[PDB]
Amino acid sequence: KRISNCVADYSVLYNSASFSTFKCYGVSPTKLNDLCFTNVYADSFVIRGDEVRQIAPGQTGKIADYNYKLPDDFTGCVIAWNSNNLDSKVGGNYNYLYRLFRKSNLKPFERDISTEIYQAGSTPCNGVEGFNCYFPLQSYGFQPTNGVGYQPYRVVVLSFELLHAPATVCGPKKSTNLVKNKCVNFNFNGLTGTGVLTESNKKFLPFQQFGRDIADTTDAVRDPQTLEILDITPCSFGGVSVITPGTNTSNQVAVLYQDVNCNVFQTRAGC
Amino acid sequence: EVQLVESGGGLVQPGGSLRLSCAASGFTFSSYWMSWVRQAPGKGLEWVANIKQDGSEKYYVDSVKGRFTISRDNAKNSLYLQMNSLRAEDTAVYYCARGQLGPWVGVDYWGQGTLVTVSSASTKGPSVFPLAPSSKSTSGGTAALGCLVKDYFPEPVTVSWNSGALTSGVHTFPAVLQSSGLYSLSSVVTVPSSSLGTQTYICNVNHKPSNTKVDKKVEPK
Amino acid sequence: NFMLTQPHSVSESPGKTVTISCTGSSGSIASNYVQWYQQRPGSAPTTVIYEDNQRPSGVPDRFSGSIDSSSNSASLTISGLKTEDEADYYCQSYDSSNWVFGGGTQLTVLGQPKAAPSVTLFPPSSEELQANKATLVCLISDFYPGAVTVAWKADSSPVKAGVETTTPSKQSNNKYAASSYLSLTPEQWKSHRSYSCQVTHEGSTVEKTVAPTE
Amino acid sequence: NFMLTQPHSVSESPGKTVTISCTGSSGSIASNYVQWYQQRPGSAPTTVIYEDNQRPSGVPDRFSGSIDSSSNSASLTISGLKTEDEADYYCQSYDSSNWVFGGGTQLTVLGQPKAAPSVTLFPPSSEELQANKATLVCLISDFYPGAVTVAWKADSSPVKAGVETTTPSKQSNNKYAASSYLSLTPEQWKSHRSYSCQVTHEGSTVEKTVAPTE
Ligand SMILES: *[C@@H]1O[C@H](CO)[C@@H](O)[C@H](O)[C@H]1NC(C)=O
Ligand SMILES: *[C@@H]1O[C@H](CO)[C@@H](O)[C@H](O)[C@H]1NC(C)=O
Structure with missing residues (x-):
């Protein structure tokens, strides 16, 4: 199953404790949230509690080499948990199939569906049941009162890959507290603008998120989480002008601002 | 900086009910895992309990199963631990443990803790005996002083001399276990023999479970 | 019955790389994460290992860890072995909805060979005897090593009943x-005639004699 | 505390290759030799695997064994699964001057879904009642599955005390x-008036009524 174009939510994944295995190869489990991925894949299969370590790369076994093989550069996570009452009734479950024989080893991320007759010896058996050839697919027997290592376990493997496509899956969107009437920087999904956010008196139609002016400048953006209209204004800029009494007359000067609004006198021509 | 205080201990009871509280600050209490962990004095570490960030799921070890309970709230940022039917094994120091993502990341958060000890068999009145060695030679361990505490239960006893005015040369021997399981100890201070009659010596004995404070004069024989 | 097996006293060496091994029994410890915890003796514990490969901020890079699957054991290696390392280590795992902690591995070591024992007697006074009680205390101090035997001698026969002796304690004099x-x-x-409390040490025996006459 | 962990019910299949895993906890089982012992129920045991790779003389080639050092487990494989496989297997090791045996892995299963249960009631005779003891036996057989409840009905009130029921047993009729x-x-x-013994099964209820008049 391929999962993409959605906000990743691993919070409920580690805030649950019903699972038995939370080993994340390649990438550390402590920082999934601040990582953006392109494609997310999730496999699912049921295996006995004995053959759970064989899912890890490097190990070898019947399941690890004939049914499911993982690459040595795996950068994902493996989730396993125990479900005995759901997967087995009082009589046991016999609809689950697995492989014990194959012509050779299996490459990673490769599955096989063919159910031919496995050949072990040199003399062919002409495609019928007999000696030196058997049926490589085998049914499995479950018990309700069996051992803890022989109860059914559900294993789900998560795979994360990076391609040239833009990231379609990122960690939960972070929404900081809104601060107004201060020279701050905001990024409302379309622009990295720096300025104040005053309270406007103009209503916006209920389909718009942006807004421009006569001079074609984005100066009005709607906040999405509370539906208020906030204006964008540059903080302040100007020049430092000085007045001088002259030479051989004085030594002190005064700082004059062109249009910056604030001994100190508030003149019409600035500060 | 994550700040933790634990204050729930300081008293002994056999098989009673006790309350310990851990208060936390500097983070968000409604998003990370919480746990409770104890260790015996002089022994190794062992796990006690854990609880989900909303208090929905709680688990214990099989030794304390049936008893014990834990609860939490996010309004005032505190952890609640309640115990019942205590035993003599429960003498341990309890730390409130804080998680990061789950039970696989690790504890990584250890409080200072509170010393919790239990005792039984109620209490009895301590006996004070400020021995006065009026006649003793020099070149000895103690010139002339003596105080003895016997027939007291349970530990500990705060021993003071002259209302804590003097603290130099005070040596307090550890308690000894008698044939009846009774504690006894003595404390000695090195003072000059010329101040037997010109200086007044007071041996102070305080016992917390027995709530007795006895102050006795020292008079040479 | 998941349990982790590790020693109790290792790394007793100055200034070179040593390793400590913690291994599991009931299941494979490589399935889940294992951590190492470092606690101050008599103070709050801390942590040196989380995620089985990374480090907390501020922890020096002298420590290092590794995992092998052939032995089902966890290896923690210490390189610097500076003067800061006085602690006992634990290994903690997670089997199913429960936490298991290690036994503990203490690491501590990174003028006169003979001391004369000072021995003092305190016979009961008149205050003790009027309450139908008699305490005779035999005090010993400043001995090395703390392997002594305390015995009481009467006029003609040693006593066996009524004598209690406590273990030696560490004082602030590098003695016991x-x-x-x-x-x-x-x-x-x-x-009786004369009372005696004798103590025995390595090639030494100090005996005192007192009389009931006061 | 060396102990070998193995299941108790496996290989309940008609016929194909199937493996049985026995694992140890305290130490590595690959250090010393391990063996597999087979026992028929009600008779003397034998051995299927010795020296961890070989089989006794006369033992068929179908059985085989293997050792996985990564798992610290031993695998026993049977291929043919013929009609001569009704036994429970054990894994045995040697740690130090002592022998350790496994728990045991029972293997037993290698026309009409409904069978009518037959109910028989045995009232006491004159020989029983003259000894001041009356026994009433309610016998049921030939039922499938063996999940039945036996209850006793008196003249006007069901009884609760004095009734004992045993678990069903396998007979030589493919029934219980x-x-x-x-x-x-x-x-x-x-x-009383009339005594009744009733039994309940899957959508079936059979009651047998008797009278004290003889
Ligand atoms: C945004 O979503 C929250 C719930 O997550 C809700 O309480 C709030 O009213 C929403 N704001 C809107 C729809 O403007
Ligand atoms: C300048 O700023 C002050 C306070 O920020 C304000 O009271 C005043 O009205 C401003 N002047 C102008 C011309 O906007």
């Missing part, structure tokens, strides 16, 4: 002190 | 049989 208590009755106190 | 015993006193035997 011990105390012995004897419970007695006044009728045999005045019916 | 169960027995029920009731201890009763003669005064209530003659003071």
Whole structure:
């Protein structure tokens, strides 16, 4: 199953404790949230509690080499948990199939569906049941009162890959507290603008998120989480002008601002 | 900086009910895992309990199963631990443990803790005996002083001399276990023999479970 | 029955790389994450290992860890072995909805060979005897090593009942002190000749004699 | 504390290759030799695997064994699964001057879904009642599955005390049989009207009624 174009939510994944295995190869489990991925894949299969370590790369076994093989550069996570009452009734479950024989080893991320007759010896058996050839697919027997290592376990493997496509899956969107009437920087999904956010008196139609002016400048953006209209204004800029009494007359000067609004006198021509 | 205080201990009871509280600050209490962990004095570490960030799921070890309970709230940022039917094994120091993502990341958060000890068999009145060695030679361990505490239960006893005015040369021997399981100890201070009659010596004995404070004069024989 | 097996006293060496091994029994410890915890003796514990490969901020890079699957053991290696390393280590795992902690591995070590024992006697006074009680305490201090035996000698026969002795304790003199208590009755106190409390050490025996006459 | 962990019910299949895993906890089982022992129920045991790779003379080639050092587990494989496989297997090792045995892995299973249960009631005779003891036996057999409940009905009130029921047992008819015993006193035997034993099964209820008049 391929999962993409959605906000990743691993919070409920580690805030649950019903699972038995939370080993994340390649990438550390402590920082999934601040990582953006392109494609997310999730496999699912049921295996006995004995053959759970064989899912890890490097190990070898019947399941690890004939049914499911993982690459040595795996950068994902493996989730396993125990479900005995759901997967087995009082009589046991016999609809689950697995492989014990194959012509050779299996490459990673490769599955096989063919159910031919496995050949072990040199003399062919002409495609019928007999000696030196058997049926490589085998049914499995479950018990309700069996051992803890022989109860059914559900294993789900998560795979994360990076391609040239833009990231379609990122960690939960972070929404900081809104601060107004201060020279701050905001990024409302379309622009990295720096300025104040005053309270406007103009209503916006209920389909718009942006807004421009006569001079074609984005100066009005709607906040999405509370539906208020906030204006964008540059903080302040100007020049430092000085007045001088002259030479051989004085030594002190005064700082004059062109249009910056604030001994100190508030003149019409600035500060 | 994550700040933790634990204050729930300081008293002994056999098989009673006790309350310990851990208060936390500097983070968000409604998003990370919480746990409770104890260790015996002089022994190794062992796990006690854990609880989900909303208090929905709680688990214990099989030794304390049936008893014990834990609860939490996010309004005032505190952890609640309640115990019942205590035993003599429960003498341990309890730390409130804080998680990061789950039970696989690790504890990584250890409080200072509170010393919790239990005792039984109620209490009895301590006996004070400020021995006065009026006649003793020099070149000895103690010139002339003596105080003895016997027939007291349970530990500990705060021993003071002259209302804590003097603290130099005070040596307090550890308690000894008698044939009846009774504690006894003595404390000695090195003072000059010329101040037997010109200086007044007071041996102070305080016992917390027995709530007795006895102050006795020292008079040479 | 998941349990982790590790020693109790290792790394007793100055200034070179040593390793400590913690291994599991009931299941494979490589399935889940294992952590190492470093606690100050008599203070709050801390952590040196989380995620089985990374480090907390501020922890020096001298420590290092590794995992092998052939032995089902966890290896923690220490390189610097500076003067800061005085602690006991634990290994903690997670099997199913429960936490298991290691036993603990203490690591501590990174003028006169003979001391004369000072011995003091405190016979009961008149205050003790008027309450039908008699405490004779035999005090010993400043001995090395703390392997001593305290015995009481009567006029003609040693006693066995009524003598209690505590373990020696560490004082602030690089020595040890011990105390012995004897419970007695006044009728045999005045019916004897001389009382003695003798102590034995390595090639040494100090005996004292007192008389009931006061 | 060396102990070998293995299941108790596996290989319940008609016929194909199937493996049985036994693992150890305290130490590595690959250090010393491990063996597999087979026992038929009700007779003397034998050995299927010795020296961890070989089989005895006369033992068929179908059985085989292997060792996985990564798992610290031993695998026993049977290929043919013929009709001569009704036994429970054990894994045995050697740690130090002692022998350790496994728990045991039972292997037993290598026309009409409904069978009518037959109910038989045995009232006490004159020989029983003259000894001041009355026994009432309610016998049921030939039922499938063996999940039945046996209850006793008196003249006007069901009884609760004095009724004992055993678990069903496998007979030589591909069915199960169960027995029920009731201890009763003669005064209530003659003071009632009719005695009934009823049994409940999957959508079936059979009741047998008897009378004290003989
Ligand atoms: C945004 O979503 C929250 C719930 O997550 C809700 O309480 C709030 O009213 C929403 N704001 C809107 C729809 O403007
Ligand atoms: C300048 O700023 C002050 C306070 O920020 C304000 O009271 C004043 O009205 C401003 N002047 C102008 C011309 O906007």
